[PDB]
Design a protein around this ligand. Structure first.
Ligand code: ATP
Ligand code: ATP
Ligand code: MG
Ligand code: ZN
Ligand code: ZN
Ligand code: ZN
Lengths: 660, 216, 432, 66
DNA sequence: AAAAAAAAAAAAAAAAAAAAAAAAAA
DNA sequence: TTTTTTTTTTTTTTTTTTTTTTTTTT
């Protein structure tokens, strides 16, 4: 037997042969199993044991292992994995399955093999800087998905049969990029016809994708580069055409006759076999964080969620934690939080569908940090799409029709509203936009679907998306002596579809200006860029978050994701008379004096906001406090969009409902 | 071992693209032109290695000129084998390869002219040093490249010169092709002039500690 | 052959000895089918499980191999209970109550296994011919030979039977028997598509008595076998999956040609005539239109009138008079205009829902396309072609472009679509 | 970086400018631009600390253009 | 001298549908 | 001024068929 000290010295003048030796491969497996079983973090809890426990619960087929953990301890194995992926991964999958069969015996009846997904590889390359020295090694490459072939079954253990000797050949592992070539018989001793051994075989899922370089990475004015990526089983359909992705994989080469024929030199083709996939569409928090999905939670994190969810005033802290560095504008923050958490969709007897998402509009003076709030919402949301003004078209926010280059049949392609299904679409400068482009979202805002009838395609899509829009008033500035209908160009059909409207006014006030200036100067002071040091960095970065954020942002992201995924509150016991009276009063005080369209569509927004406030508390039932808070929000959103003449009377008239 | 390269520069006289004649094939020259297209950095096969199917004997350092060339005689004369080898892609040595297209300069172009073009091959450490739109001076050796498709490429993928566009009828039979060789068969081999370059030149950090290092 | 005989015997005993109460149902169904020249048999899997579990287990793991044995058992029983012989091989149609699998959950784990799934028909191909009995002759010795083929996936012998060439054999087309083959295309249910994904499609093959049974746009339930066929895509050793249909359930009673005949048993006709005699049937029908919408009684009455439709007349001089009703709703936002359009789509047996913003004249009336293989031009239907004999609901009608809206003028009244493009000059029917 | 008295001088100058404007032309962006100009003027003198004289110069430059 | 296997031979192109710009006007 | 109008721009080849005529290969 060998020791971790003995793996340092190498023989055979090649690392692959050194790894594949029988004596070395027995020490490697034992060391990998010890790493899997005995690793503990700072708090003292084994992480891979918990991951294995969750694997069986979720009926998963893959295990995620961080490269930093295996590099910090047993760094020689980390170097071996870095240089020689193919041989290390076969052993590591086997040891992973052996470790898994210590928590779930008889798990082989569910899945027969456990795959390992590597995460947080240190060195990141671009497609432009790939050379021949990276051949047969693990690489990390960012790109943009362009085209996807589709899922087909592929042979796994290939068999052959020869007729004159009737010989059956042993199973062959297919390279997945090179056809199995066999010409010699162990029995026939000569060339013979070979069959595929019809039936009695094992298949795998296979797919192929093309990655172009991201426009941001490409130097301005230069042509992009592309490469081909092969996705095997458990990795199919994860990436979608149009998204931006980061892939960790193995860089390989193969001989192509056409490439040699056209160029005129013995050049080879290259392709990447994908190992790990991470989505980066809309994510600017990629600067930090560890893992393949930063919106996923562990068991202790869920327990912490349920612990902090029962504190009184959780809603106040959640609201205060929205865009902490922006000063004031608490109504905007409340509307943003309500939109982010969202309502509950409904279907009554399978024939009547009711939408459950909140849309927000921000109409305000220039220089009031609306765009920064939109950027914060983009960063925090799980799925987010951004658009602005004249840069969007009718079919750029909807589905488009294209001729498939391969199949040559008319096909549907995605858009901004489809890329943000169960997400958020943000539209900055929503008033500086063509009417034909603006009117394309009428169906998606309410019916949450898209219908296309073009070139023989008659289909209906699904876009369960929420819209937060920012606009400027006529003349660039809001006239408080005029009603709303003469401060904007939008008509009733599009104004009715919005749930919350926030009018932002800039007024002269010495104390307010002094406080805002002090806050902004302190913020600029804070953001100036000037045990293990890598954790000293974390503690210093947490100290700065302590002042202005009641809860950390990374915790809040997982909190929002868990709340949206798991909770579905109901409305069993509530006061119908109060809501009916509020709706009737709001309808009466609109035609008499007002220019804010109120229909039945605004009655349901109160219930949606109540369900959102219930979601904020991780409660399964809506209480009276949440409904009262929703009524107060709706009433304050209507009173503050009036003329200065009647606002004082309307506020007094509507004040009886919001007694608390 | 490090596959070495020798780079020559500062030649006495420079040539234009329209001075390229077949009587300088094999000579060391320097040329100037404007780059208009570059390709990817592909790996080229330099020193091949194979294994006999039956003996499992290993052959190494099989030179290749312009097409995939496998060995002929097995290392052991006891074995009789003419073909059926298996490339050991891991043991083989590779090199970087790039093809760039250049055209004539704005001044060398006559009053009325359709610009002439050329194919320049950059190899080794000289990849990506020429960017489209720039004016660069290359230096290297003028070579000639045959048509490998009719030289019997192993795979069926070439499929005997599959084409998507129609060839010129004017030069049908006018382009002098040589015949007679056994590898060709009854086919006719054709040649075209390209350039191979060994040296390229162009003729058209807020950190205080590192900044203080560079200055004298 | 020593196991196939016992399998056929077991199937024949199942057919001849199954009884519930006091009637051999599967013995009577065969005789009733033979009389009206229906050469097929429908078997429920629950009965087969109840009779013997080994027989069910044999079928569940080797369908393509076992099913023809049941096929020949049926026609052996038929010749015994019908004749003391122009009876072709019968067909087996299966019914299942197992869980339905989504299309996107079908993968390499489900190969060569019987599955149950549901989707939407988008296209139906033309009928093609497949050989079952082949008469064969050799090019040199010239002697007769025969071959029998079953469609559960063969070639002429690569030899000679009694110098002749390598594989010398030709087909004598007369005295050969053929059947009917059809190809269909499926698609996912719109509400079951995952997040951010476009719907995917699949290919199915139907034979003999299951051809001309569905029309595009129909929602169906399919029972069949998930298989693969090697063909042709630069991947190595990849195959294309498809489904061979064994049983079809369709919501719309209409066949491919909509025979305009009654498909209602007397037990339902009695119910319908009893309903028609209700003195307050008008109120009952009106109250059933969108019970979750308050008020708007006149609009609901108009919707009922549109659903029933008027009468159509033809005159001696060739005149044709329209018998369909069109309705326009021009109103204020928030008045439930768009919640009635989607209800009419659900209630109507044939109905299409479209939006005026995402539409075009070619997509609404008809389009002309080029076949990649044949490289000719053919006509493809549109929204008003699919919704023939039904209702089309056009939302956001005011947002339509002025070029696209004018293409509906002829279809609304003359109920025809005239195409005069690319050497194709035809007039298509459209009664919507 | 910014010192202790520099922040007080900055807020005082912003308040004075806002008072003199009267909110039509002066916003938070003007204060941010004044901070930027002060930092640039500090970079000119090769000094890593900001003195209220720099803020006074930036304020004069802003006033000269309004 | 007599078998089994393996490529050449393609060619072709108008006619229509959808989407984004760069010039016209109630 | 925001509406309508207008040119116009790639969209194309991945497939076929059984003879007929060539090279290898017992
Ligand atoms: N409390 C605050 N109110 C307004 N602006 C603030 C505040 N705190 C900081 N700022 C800064 O003021 C600047 C003005 O913000 P921003 O550019 O979003 O304004 P805007 O007029 O809403 O933008 P746009 O026209 O792009 O929608 C930003 O640099 C922002 O960071
Ligand atoms: N009379 C009503 N009874 C019940 N629900 C109603 C009624 N009127 C409107 N609603 C509700 O109002 C919401 C919006 O209605 P809908 O989408 O049908 O509007 P619409 O008439 O199509 O508007 P638009 O003119 O803006 O397109 C739905 O949730 C619908 O259930
Ligand atoms: Mg509507
Ligand atoms: Zn053999
Ligand atoms: Zn040998
Ligand atoms: Zn014969």
């Amino acid at each position: 037997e060998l020791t971790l000290e003995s793996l340092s010295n190498v023989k055979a003048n090649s690392y692959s042969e050194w790894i594949t030796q029988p004596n070395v491969s027995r020490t490697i497996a034992r060391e990998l199993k010890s790493f899997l079983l005995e690793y503990t973090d700072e708090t003292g809890r084994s992480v891979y044991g918990a991951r294995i426990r969750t694997l069986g619960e979720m009926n998963s087929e893959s295990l995620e292992v961080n490269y930093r953990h295996l590099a910090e301890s047993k760094a020689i194995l980390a170097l071996f994995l870095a240089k020689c992926p193919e041989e290390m991964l076969k052993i590591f999958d086997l040891v992973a399955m052996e470790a898994t069969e210590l928590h779930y015996p008889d798990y082989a009846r569910i899945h027969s093999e456990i795959h390992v997904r590597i995460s947080d590889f240190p060195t990141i390359y671009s497609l432009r800087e790939l050379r021949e020295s990276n051949l047969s090694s693990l690489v990390r490459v960012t790109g943009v998905v362009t085209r996807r072939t589709g899922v087909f079954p592929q042979l796994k253990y290939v068999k052959f049969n020869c007729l004159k000797c009737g010989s059956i050949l042993g199973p062959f592992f297919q390279d997945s990029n090179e056809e199995i070539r066999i010409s010699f018989c162990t029995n026939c001793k000569s060339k013979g016809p070979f069959r595929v051994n019809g039936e009695k075989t094992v298949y795998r899922n296979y797919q192929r994708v093309t990655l172009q370089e991201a426009p941001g990475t490409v130097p301005p004015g230069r042509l992009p580069r592309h490469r081909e990526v092969i996705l095997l089983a458990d990795l199919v359909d994860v990436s979608k055409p149009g998204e931006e992705v980061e892939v960790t994989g193995i860089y390989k080469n193969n001989y192509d006759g056409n490439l040699n024929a056209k160029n005129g030199f013995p050049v080879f083709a290259t392709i990447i076999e994908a190992n790990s996939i991470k989505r980066r569409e809309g994510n600017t928090a990629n600067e930090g964080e560890e893992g393949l999905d930063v919106f996923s939670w562990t068991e202790e994190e869920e327990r912490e969620f349920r612990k902090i969810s029962r504190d009184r005033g959780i809603i106040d802290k959640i609201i205060s934690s929205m865009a902490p560095s922006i000063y004031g504008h608490r109504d905007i923050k409340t509307a943003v939080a309500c939109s982010l958490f969202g309502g509950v969709p409904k279907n009554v007897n399978g024939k009547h569908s009711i939408r459950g998402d909140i849309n927000v509009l921000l109409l305000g003076d220039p220089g009031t940090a609306k765009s920064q709030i939109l950027k914060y919402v983009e960063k925090t949301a799980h799925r987010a799409v951004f658009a602005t003004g004249q840069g969007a078209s009718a079919v750029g926010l909807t589905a488009s029709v294209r001729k498939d280059p391969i199949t040559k049949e008319w096909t549907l392609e995605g858009g901004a509203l489809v890329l943000a299904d169960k997400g958020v679409c943000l539209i900055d400068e929503f008033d500086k936009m063509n009417d034909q482009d603006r009117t394309s979202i009428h169906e998606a805002m309410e019916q949450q679907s898209i219908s296309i009838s073009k070139a023989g395609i008659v289909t209906t899509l699904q876009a369960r998306c929420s819209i937060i829009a920012a606009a400027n008033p006529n003349g660039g500035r809001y006239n408080s002596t005029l009603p709303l209908a003469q401060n904007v160009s939008l008509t009733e059909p599009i104004l009715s579809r919005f749930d919350i409207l926030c009018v932002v006014r800039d007024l002269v006030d010495e104390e307010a200006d002094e406080r805002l200036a002090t806050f902004v100067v302190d913020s600029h002071v804070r953001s100036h860029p000037e045990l293990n040091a890598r954790q000293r960095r974390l503690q210093r970065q947490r100290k700065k978050e302590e002042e202005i954020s009641p809860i950390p942002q990374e915790l809040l992201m997982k909190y929002i994701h868990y709340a949206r995924t798991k909770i579905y509150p109901k409305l069993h016991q509530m006061d119908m008379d109060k809501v009916s009276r509020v709706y009737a009063d709001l309808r009466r005080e609109s035609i008499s004096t007002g220019s804010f369209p109120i229909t039945v569509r605004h009655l349901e927004s109160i219930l949606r906001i109540a369900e959102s406030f219930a979601k904020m508390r991780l409660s399964e039932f809506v209480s009276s406090y949440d409904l009262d808070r929703a009524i107060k929000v709706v009433v304050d959103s209507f009173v503050d969009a009036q003329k200065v003449s009647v606002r004082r009377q309307l506020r007094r008239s509507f004040a009886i409902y919001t007694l608390g | 071992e490090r596959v070495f390269q020798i780079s020559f520069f500062n030649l006495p006289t420079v040539h234009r693209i329209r001075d390229i004649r077949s009587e300088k094939i094999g000579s060391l020259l320097s040329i100037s032109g404007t780059v208009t297209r570059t390709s990817e950095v592909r790996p080229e096969l330099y020193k091949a290695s194979f294994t006999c199917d039956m003996c499992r004997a290993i052959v190494d350092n099989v030179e290749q000129s312009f097409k995939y060339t496998e060995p002929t005689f097995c290392p052991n004369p006891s074995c009789e084998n003419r073909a059926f080898w298996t490339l050991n892609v891991t043991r083989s040595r590779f090199l970087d390869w790039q093809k760039v297209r250049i055209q004539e300069n704005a001044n060398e172009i006559p009053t009325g002219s359709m610009p002439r073009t050329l194919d320049v091959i950059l190899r080794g450490d000289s990849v990506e040093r020429a960017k489209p739109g720039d004016r660069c001076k290359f230096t290297g050796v003028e070579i000639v490249v045959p048509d490998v498709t009719q030289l019997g490429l192993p795979g069926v993928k070439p499929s005997s010169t599959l084409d998507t566009r129609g060839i010129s009828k004017t030069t049908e039979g006018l382009n002098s092709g040589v015949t007679g060789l056994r590898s060709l068969g009854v086919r006719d081999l054709t040649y075209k002039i390209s350039f191979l370059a060994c040296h390229v030149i162009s003729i058209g950090e807020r950190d205080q500690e590192v900044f203080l290092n560079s200055l004298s | 052959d020593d196991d196939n005989t016992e399998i056929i015997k077991s199937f024949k005993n199942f057919i001849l000895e199954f009884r519930l109460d006091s009637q051999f149902i599967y013995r009577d169904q065969l005789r009733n089918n033979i009389l009206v020249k229906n050469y097929s048999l429908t078997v429920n899997m629950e009965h087969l499980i109840g009779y013997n579990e080994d027989i069910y287990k044999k079928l569940s793991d080797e369908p393509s191999d076992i099913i023809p044995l049941f096929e020949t058992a049926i026609t052996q029983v038929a010749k015994r209970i019908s004749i003391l012989n122009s009876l072709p091989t019968f067909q087996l149609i299966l019914n299942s109550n197992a869980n339905q699998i989504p299309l996107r959950d079908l993968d390499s784990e489900h190969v060569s296994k019987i599955v149950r799934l549901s989707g939407i028909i988008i296209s139906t191909s033309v009928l093609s011919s497949r050989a079952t009995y082949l008469s064969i002759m050799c090019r040199n010795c010239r002697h007769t030979t025969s071959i029998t083929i079953n469609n559960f996936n063969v070639s002429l012998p690569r030899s000679c039977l009694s110098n002749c060439g390598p594989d010398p054999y030709i087909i004598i087309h007369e005295s050969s028997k053929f059947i009917d083959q059809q190809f269909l295309k499926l698609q996912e249910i719109p509400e079951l598509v995952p997040v951010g994904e476009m719907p995917r499609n699949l290919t199915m093959t139907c034979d003999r008595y299951l051809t001309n049974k569905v029309i595009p746009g129909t929602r169906v339930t399919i029972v069949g076998i998930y298989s693969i066929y090697n063909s042709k895509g630069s991947g190595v050793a990849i195959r294309t999956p498809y489904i061979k249909i064994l049983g079809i359930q369709s919501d719309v009673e209409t066949s491919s040609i909509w025979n305009s005949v009654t498909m209602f048993t007397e037990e339902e006709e009695e119910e319908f005539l009893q309903l028609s005699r209700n003195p307050k049937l008008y109120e009952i029908l009106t109250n059933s239109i969108a019970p979750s919408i308050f008020g708007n009684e006149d609009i609901k009455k108009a919707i009922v009138c549109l659903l029933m439709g008027g009468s159509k007349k033809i005159l001696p001089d060739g005149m044709r008079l329209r018998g369909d009703i069109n309705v326009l709703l021009l109103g204020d936002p928030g008045t439930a205009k768009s919640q009635l359009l989607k209800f009419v789509e659900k209630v109507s047996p044939i109905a299409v829902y479209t939006s005026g913003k995402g539409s075009s004249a070619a997509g609404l009336t008809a389009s002309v396309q080029r076949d990649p293989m044949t490289r000719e031009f053919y006509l493809e239907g549109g929204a008003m072609v699919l919704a023939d004999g039904g209702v089309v609901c056009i939302d956001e009608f005011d947002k339509m472009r002025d070029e696209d809206r004018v293409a509906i003028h002829e279809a609304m009244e003359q109920q025809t679509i005239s195409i005069a493009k690319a050497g194709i000059t035809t007039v298509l029917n459209s009664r919507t | 970086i910014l010192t202790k008295e520099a922040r007080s001088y900055l807020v005082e100058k912003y308040k004075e400018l806002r008072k003199d404007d009267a909110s039509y032309r002066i916003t938070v962006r003007q204060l941010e631009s004044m901070i930027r100009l002060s930092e640039a003027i500090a970079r000119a003198n090769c000094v890593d600390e900001i003195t209220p004289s720099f803020i006074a110069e930036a304020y004069d430059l802003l006033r000269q253009s309004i």
